[PDB]
Design a protein around this ligand. Structure first.
Ligand SMILES: CC(C)CCC[C@@H](C)CCC[C@@H](C)CCC[C@@H](C)CCOC[C@@H](CO)OCC[C@H](C)CCC[C@H](C)CCC[C@H](C)CCCC(C)C
Ligand SMILES: CC(C)CCC[C@@H](C)CCC[C@@H](C)CCC[C@@H](C)CCOC[C@@H](CO)OCC[C@H](C)CCC[C@H](C)CCC[C@H](C)CCCC(C)C
Ligand SMILES: CC(C)CCC[C@@H](C)CCC[C@@H](C)CCC[C@@H](C)CCOC[C@@H](CO)OCC[C@H](C)CCC[C@H](C)CCC[C@H](C)CCCC(C)C
Ligand SMILES: CC(C)CCC[C@@H](C)CCC[C@@H](C)CCC[C@@H](C)CCOC[C@@H](CO)OCC[C@H](C)CCC[C@H](C)CCC[C@H](C)CCCC(C)C
Ligand SMILES: CC(C)CCC[C@@H](C)CCC[C@@H](C)CCC[C@@H](C)CCOC[C@@H](CO)OCC[C@H](C)CCC[C@H](C)CCC[C@H](C)CCCC(C)C
Ligand SMILES: CC(C)CCC[C@@H](C)CCC[C@@H](C)CCC[C@@H](C)CCOC[C@@H](CO)OCC[C@H](C)CCC[C@H](C)CCC[C@H](C)CCCC(C)C
Ligand SMILES: *C/C=C(C)/C=C/C=C(C)/C=C/C1=C(C)CCCC1(C)C
Ligand SMILES: *C/C=C(C)/C=C/C=C(C)/C=C/C1=C(C)CCCC1(C)C
Ligand SMILES: *C/C=C(C)/C=C/C=C(C)/C=C/C1=C(C)CCCC1(C)C
Ligand SMILES: CCCCCCCCCCCCCCC
Ligand SMILES: CCCCCCCCCCCCCCC
Ligand SMILES: CCCCCCCCCCCCCCC
Ligand SMILES: CCCCCCCCCCCCCCC
Ligand SMILES: CCCCCCCCCCCCCCC
Ligand SMILES: CCCCCCCCCCCCCCC
Ligand SMILES: CCCCCCCCCCCCCC
Ligand SMILES: CCCCCCCCCCCCCC
Ligand SMILES: CCCCCCCCCCCCC
Ligand SMILES: CCCCCCCCCCCCC
Ligand SMILES: CCCCCCCCCCCCC
Ligand SMILES: CCCCCCCCCCC
Ligand SMILES: CCCCCCCCCCC
Ligand SMILES: CCCCCCCCCCC
Ligand SMILES: CCCCCCCCCC
Ligand SMILES: CCCCCCCCCC
Ligand SMILES: CCCCCCCCCC
Ligand SMILES: CCCCCCCCC
Ligand SMILES: CCCCCCCCC
Ligand SMILES: CCCCCCCCC
Ligand SMILES: CCCCCCCC
Ligand SMILES: CCCCCCCC
Ligand SMILES: CCCCCCCC
Ligand SMILES: CCCCCCCC
Ligand SMILES: CCCCCCCC
Ligand SMILES: CCCCCCCC
Ligand SMILES: CCCCCCCC
Lengths: 231, 231, 231
């Protein structure tokens, strides 16, 4: 484990995702509202999945070597197995908050799968220049997601209860800022141009992951928007 | 790229799926009917997924070598990753058109997963004679799907609006004819008996894919069956 | 095939899953109740999936070698591909029986995915002591599932029709007893401590699989709880 300088950030990430999972699990014990139960189930699964994948990276299972640039490059593939399941769950939290229609939910989840799937292909591609073709396709899929979150959901939240509109607006802004950083870290990190070393890259993804999952969840599950209007 | 004679058909397929995706995306911009939005989302995702997998084959990522018959045989595995997601989406288009019940939808999607999954196992199997055992199981799963589309959905469409009944009947006939060709191309192509060479096999799958996805989508999204009855 | 002593139990399992699939398929022909169709579709898919994965193990495709303990250990990875899809389908049978809320269904299916996913990682892990870390995480996920089936569903079934309450109680008890045996067989078998040899381990999993899928299905599909109350 300790033979890799980035191990400290993988261990911290593992701990923070595990602690986040347990807090949400305990906090959700005393909840019977069927609407609130939906948000607790979605939001608790997110850091639980991330916990297992951070642990796999810490123990060395989620790491492979990819030859490109005449070098064997360490690629943590477990990140994409994490994101494949956690990013659509996070979008479902937002879509259920605004009572989005089914067709829009399917478009979001499908574009998200394309985003993560093409990012994985780009991470494992051995022809250096082709890695950035996949990065560009994946980034186009992300821009579609961000467009929908702004010019489809925002207008839908305003016609909703005030507390669900204000909570959505906050979580929307958090998501757009944090998610946009991921393609940048990829491009300048060891998967892309190799400007930033792997140990610093790992620290950046850990800060982003914890903020986008645990921080996101703390804002959502403390809001009254997750409960139905009741007397 | 150009070192493979089949590259021209992979490049054409990539272009036609990309163009198809963009047309459906633009055409769906001016749509607010929640029913129509469902069909546009399903139908636009189909060629978008196929685009990415054709590109992976063009660039050489979606290709592996499988030893059988005393030879290293080029097997494009990316086809099955495509079909795993696009064939159930196409069946969902048909099932939603006739307002199929949930139990029937689950049976269709499950049989479809078995069809594609066993076809993938057959494509990667190293014992030559066993490849055709998997082909037979996969073909049995397809025949179940075709039976349901005829002796379960057809009777349901007649009790529906006339425009949804006539549109379903057309898309049903297109699907049964085109899908039935796939097991035949597999059997006589490089995955099976090896009668037809890979470059011709690739041309045939490209014609079938574009027809079953883009051609299918053009018929559906030009129909009024996708809109609810409104004044 | 016959070069492996466990082949006899893989062949028996294949036959019993295939026969089970055909019986459920025939029995479900004469069913039009939309509620009953749901249970028949879920319950017939379970042994059909298991059939294909037992066949892959029989023919040698679903087997790999994992080095640990200074030895190349035969690991049947196809079991986890089976369980990944069949265990959530079995939980869906139970959840639909008691009309569970959506949030609870998602929590069950998500915990089940974590259970199977971490068990697969543990089966393929090359550092011997780490294999049991994954076993423990997977077992914690199972205990969560069992808790929900007892202290969330049981109370919900009592407020239901008597026949659905008594049928659920029976299937609940069958599930908790049979599922609990799996982590024990893993721990003492070739994936874990290696006390029980592989051929005996394979026999035990076959008895458990057939009972948990075909036996489970025979109890459910003979009950009147799967039909709506009708005159
Ligand atoms: C009902 O809706 C509320 C349940 O949602 C919340 C239910 C959760 C979604 C269930 C998923 C958690 C499982 C219990 C998994 C247990 C293993 C975890 C990874 C444990 C990690 C923390 C600890 C080991 C440090
Ligand atoms: C509606 C939305 C959900 C739609 C989703 C969008 C999606 C279509 C976007 C594209 C996804 C696609 C790129 C997934 C590729 C997975 C692949 C990286 C797995 C590893 O295989 C890659 C190479 C080794 O580098 O295999 C070496 C050769 C091996 C012999 C490969 C044989 C196994 C194949 C991988 C079998 C295909 C399985 C499916 C891809 C499983 C789904 C994986 C997940 C990442 C989507
Ligand atoms: C709301 O419902 C309508 C949206 O459906 C339609 C929405 C679509 C389903 C969203 C999926 C498309 C994404 C925007 C993916 C973008 C990358 C594409 C693969 C681009 C391919 C064409 C071009 C690069 C040649
Ligand atoms: C309700 C419906 C959706 C049900 C679906 C029906 C489905 C059950 C039908 C059978 C599907 C099954 C054959 C999928 C097999 C995937 C497999 C080809 C992936 C590549 O692995 C094959 C060998 C190399 O040749 O791995 C070499 C050895 C490696 C060490 C393998 C270890 C990884 C395992 C593959 C882990 C299992 C992952 C799941 C199979 C992922 C789903 C893939 C998709 C193709 C279903
Ligand atoms: C409508 O709801 C009822 C259909 O459910 C029941 C429908 C089933 C869920 C459909 C799935 C079965 C498919 C027909 C697959 C056929 C291949 C099987 C694996 C055959 C195995 C048995 C035989 C080959 C020994
Ligand atoms: C809501 C719920 C459904 C959530 C589900 C819970 C889930 C997150 C729990 C953890 C699942 C995770 C451990 C799955 C790992 C699959 C992995 C074993 C496949 C084989 O790859 C392992 C190594 C060889 O040993 O690959 C060698 C290196 C290769 C180069 C690997 C590159 C391919 C990657 C495997 C791509 C990721 C694909 C996804 C993991 C596909 C889903 C598989 C299924 C088992 C979940
Ligand atoms: C909890 C994890 C989250 C919210 C991860 C989000 C990840 C992304 C938005 C990743 C995006 C990428 C691109 C847009 C292209 C480059 C490759 C990716 C996958 C890093
Ligand atoms: C857009 C792609 C489509 C509609 C693909 C359809 C593919 C099939 C219907 C494939 C069927 C197969 C068999 C029936 C057995 C032989 C292997 C397959 C997977 C080619
Ligand atoms: C039809 C198959 C069924 C119902 C299989 C159930 C399997 C389990 C409940 C497996 C549980 C495991 C653990 C709890 C940890 C050890 C590894 C597993 C996956 C065997
Ligand atoms: C979206 C965030 C990207 C900003 C990356 C900042 C990295 C600064 C760290 C110093 C770079 C290390 C280079 C010298 C080793
Ligand atoms: C009462 C609110 C705080 C509860 C404690 C939460 C502990 C989980 C770890 C959170 C750290 C990361 C927060 C986002 C920066
Ligand atoms: C379902 C369509 C299958 C028909 C295949 C027709 C192939 C004819 C092309 C000529 C065969 C090439 C053999 C000589 C190289
Ligand atoms: C107005 C209808 C035609 C629009 C142009 C569609 C261009 C997408 C490519 C379609 C070619 C394949 C059609 C099926 C044979
Ligand atoms: C949950 C069931 C686990 C019980 C396992 C009993 C196995 C007894 C078979 C004899 C053990 C073989 C050891 C000598 C070869
Ligand atoms: C009339 C009920 C029996 C029908 C025959 C079922 C045959 C399928 C194989 C069942 C054997 C396994 C039963 C569970 C132990
Ligand atoms: C490729 C993996 C995608 C599945 C991720 C799991 C979450 C799915 C959310 C589905 C939302 C409901 C759509 C109607
Ligand atoms: C194995 C991958 C299957 C999932 C394909 C994605 C489409 C799923 C459609 C689900 C239809 C809704 C069923 C109720
Ligand atoms: C185009 C939709 C408007 C909202 C999206 C904001 C774009 C942020 C740019 C992200 C940069 C990634 C490289
Ligand atoms: C048996 C259901 C009737 C409709 C299915 C038509 C069968 C077409 C044969 C396809 C040939 C594939 C080898
Ligand atoms: C803790 C929830 C109560 C019901 C679960 C029964 C636990 C059975 C123990 C299984 C042993 C697996 C190692
Ligand atoms: C080795 C660098 C080659 C540059 C390729 C950049 C491709 C980016 C595509 C974005 C449209
Ligand atoms: C090398 C050819 C061996 C023939 C096997 C055919 C199997 C087909 C099974 C269809 C029932
Ligand atoms: C080689 C045996 C090492 C023992 C590790 C046991 C780990 C079990 C963790 C359960 C909390
Ligand atoms: C609940 C605390 C979980 C912390 C265990 C993971 C941290 C790795 C320490 C080496
Ligand atoms: C929108 C046009 C997309 C065409 C790019 C793919 C074709 C491959 C050319 C080499
Ligand atoms: C319907 C009977 C299915 C039996 C075939 C599988 C058994 C393997 C025999 C070698
Ligand atoms: C993106 C930063 C999240 C901050 C988490 C703190 C929330 C406390 C209510
Ligand atoms: C299967 C052939 C499809 C033909 C596509 C043309 C549709 C234009 C309306
Ligand atoms: C767990 C044992 C199941 C027994 C199956 C027999 C059911 C006949 C109704
Ligand atoms: C109005 C809410 C502002 C939230 C933005 C937070 C950016 C990290
Ligand atoms: C909408 C604000 C985008 C912020 C992008 C930050 C990328 C590091
Ligand atoms: C490929 C772009 C299509 C141009 C608009 C078609 C008419 C909606
Ligand atoms: C009555 C519609 C006929 C459609 C059949 C088309 C076959 C390619
Ligand atoms: C229902 C007509 C079937 C046509 C099969 C064509 C196979 C090449
Ligand atoms: C009251 C029903 C008892 C069922 C338990 C069966 C254990 C195999
Ligand atoms: C609730 C009874 C548990 C039985 C466990 C059996 C494990 C072999």
């Amino acid at each position: 484990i300790t033979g890799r300088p980035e191990w400290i950030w993988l261990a911290l990430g593992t701990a923070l995702m595990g602690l986040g999972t347990l807090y949400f699990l305990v906090k959700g014990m005393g909840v019977s509202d069927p609407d609130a139960k939906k948000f607790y189930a979605i939001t608790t699964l997110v850091p639980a999945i991330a916990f297992t994948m951070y642990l796999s990276m810490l123990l060395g299972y989620g790491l492979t070597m990819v030859p490109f640039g005449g070098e064997q490059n360490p690629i943590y593939w477990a990140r994409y197995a994490d994101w494949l399941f956690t990013t659509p769950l996070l979008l479902l939290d937002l879509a259920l908050l605004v009572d989005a229609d089914q067709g829009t939910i399917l478009a979001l989840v499908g574009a998200d799968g394309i985003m993560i799937g093409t990012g994985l292909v780009g991470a494992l591609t051995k022809v250096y220049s082709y890695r950035f073709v996949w990065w560009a396709i994946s980034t186009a899929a992300m821009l579609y997601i961000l467009y929908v979150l702004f010019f489809g959901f925002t207008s839908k939240a305003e016609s909703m209860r005030p507390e669900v509109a204000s909570t959505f607006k906050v979580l929307r802004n958090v998501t757009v800022v944090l998610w946009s950083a991921y393609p940048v870290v990829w491009l300048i990190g060891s998967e892309g141009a190799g400007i930033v070393p792997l140990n610093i890259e790992t620290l950046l993804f850990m800060v982003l992951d914890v903020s986008a999952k645990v921080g996101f969840g703390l804002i959502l599950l403390r809001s009254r928007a997750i409960f139905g209007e009741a007397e």
